[PDB]
């Protein structure tokens, strides 16, 4: 009467999909991506990603890129660091791209595995432990070469106003900007003035990213900016997230992918907690604060639901938050976010959720 068949595509359309990167830290060699429908909490499929996988979706929405490490015998044998290209709709493996055996192994901050605005190059963090940035040419299926200029820096912030430019945060407290040629090699670079004091006011690496500028929050609740609208980056800050009452209660930010920006309104979203002190920078959110980056005023505060990471969708005006296991879906079309639902048990140990891209040209 019936026959079990494969070859099927994901049941829900792309615009319903989100990707929860489950590190499965307790069994980190079997990390995976869980694909969910955010409109109803339905589990749609998954992509296996071996040891401490990282993931992103191609800007054009057609493919899922993963980055992982294999060994011939898992805990022994030769190492293979790879990027893999998977079909988004069929959730099937297509191509492996070999990397040098130094891709970053670590928690899933967005900035460790990114791509150029034009989608032609994947841009990833290496640590051997010496740091450099890796460039992969997606079309060719090749690793280009190490961006050695980035030694002593960390993470990738693409510039959405340029086709193949990105920045990284360096140990001098400034930003290094890299502009790639059509072959994925470094064509030019520049270094900003010092944005923040590494010793006195360290920033979280997660950017609140606009089309031509990026904002960063600090361990002490200050905000810094890198404006890349002109030929070289202009830096500024601090301004404080905190009013007098806030300061009196020692409110500070905490989390991993802990900020987001809604570009059309300029609202910045930040996970915050009271009783801040040395060691609290990764504490779950007591609250989410919504700041107007133009007026430098807070415009809303809502319960944080112990969230640790978030992501923003500009095309649907949404924020997702994530506490390690459960994903909260918020409507952010008005200053006060509205909670639509929570997807329970999306992951065992995820610090990163991302939307399937819609539009964005």
């Amino acid at each position: 009467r019936e026959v079990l068949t494969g070859g099927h595509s994901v049941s829900a359309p792309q615009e319903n999909r989100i990707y929860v990167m489950d590190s499965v830290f307790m069994h980190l060699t079997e990390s995976r991506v869980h694909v969910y429908d955010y409109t109803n909490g339905k589990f749609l499929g998954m992509v296996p990603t071996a040891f401490n996988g990282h993931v992103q979706v191609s800007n054009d929405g057609k493919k899922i890129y993963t980055m992982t490490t294999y060994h011939e015998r898992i805990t022994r044998g030769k190492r293979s660091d790879v990027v893999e290209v998977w079909d988004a709709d069929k959730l099937t493996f297509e191509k492996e791209i070999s990397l040098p055996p130094k891709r970053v192994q670590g928690l899933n901050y967005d900035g460790l595995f990114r791509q150029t605005t034009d989608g032609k190059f994947i841009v990833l963090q290496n640590a051997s432990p010496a740091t450099s940035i890796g460039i992969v040419d997606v079309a060719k299926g090749d690793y280009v070469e190490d961006v050695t200029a980035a030694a002593g820096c960390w993470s990738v912030i693409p510039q959405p106003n340029r086709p193949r430019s990105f920045m990284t945060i360096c140990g001098d407290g400034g930003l290094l900007t890299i502009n790639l040629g059509e072959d994925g090699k470094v064509a030019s670079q520049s270094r900003s003035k010092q944005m923040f004091s590494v010793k006195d006011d360290p920033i979280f690496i997660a950017p609140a990213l606009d089309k031509d500028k990026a904002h960063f929050v600090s361990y002490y609740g200050n905000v810094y900016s890198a404006d890349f609208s002109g030929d070289e980056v202009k830096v500024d800050g601090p301004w404080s997230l905190l009013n007098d009452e806030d300061k009196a209660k020692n409110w500070v930010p905490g989390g991993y992918n802990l900020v987001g920006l809604h570009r059309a309104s300029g609202r910045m979203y930040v996970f915050m907690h009271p009783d801040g002190k040395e060691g609290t920078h990764k504490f779950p959110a007591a609250e989410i604060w919504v700041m107007d980056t133009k007026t430098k005023q807070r415009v809303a505060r809502i319960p944080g639901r112990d969230a640790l990471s978030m992501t923003i969708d500009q095309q649907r005006n949404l924020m997702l938050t994530l506490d390690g296991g459960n994903v909260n879906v918020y409507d952010i079309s008005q200053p006060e976010p509205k909670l639509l639902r929570t997807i329970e048990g999306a992951a065992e140990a995820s610090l990163q959720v991302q939307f399937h891209p819609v539009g964005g040209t």
Binding site: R1, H8, T92
Partner: protein, 119 residues
């Protein structure tokens, strides 16, 4: 009774659904597939354990093939361990403590289901 795709999903996704009477594993219908379709990117097994289950909705007994979907890591959802008429490995095709993905191109076990063969 015979057409899970027309049923409430809560019903088909339960280990007590009548056709799941010898399922040891994660129900594929909870894993982005349906009772008769592997989740995207997982491959049906060409072999399976088999058995019969009673359908209390129409009062008839049906032959079921418990095929797996394979080549992806464990789905983890809707784990069942039901054992009606299940027998040990000396009656091998009635046995559900072995990986029925074992002869697939990639034998990693993803999920299991219950395919309706006939009366």
């Amino acid at each position: 009774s015979l057409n899970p795709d027309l049923a409430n999903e809560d019903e088909v996704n339960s280990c007590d659904y009548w056709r799941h009477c010898a399922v040891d594993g994660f129900l594929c219908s909870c894993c982005g597939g349906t009772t008769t379709t592997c989740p995207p990117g997982s491959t049906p097994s060409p072999i399976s354990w088999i058995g019969t289950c009673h359908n209390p909705h129409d009062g008839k007994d049906y032959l079921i093939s418990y095929h797996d979907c394979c080549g992806k890591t464990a789905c983890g959802r809707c784990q069942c361990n039901t054992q009606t008429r299940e027998r040990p490995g000396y009656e091998f095709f009635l046995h559900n403590d072995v990986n029925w993905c074992m002869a697939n191109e990639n034998s990693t076990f993803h999920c299991t289901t219950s395919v309706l063969v006939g009366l």
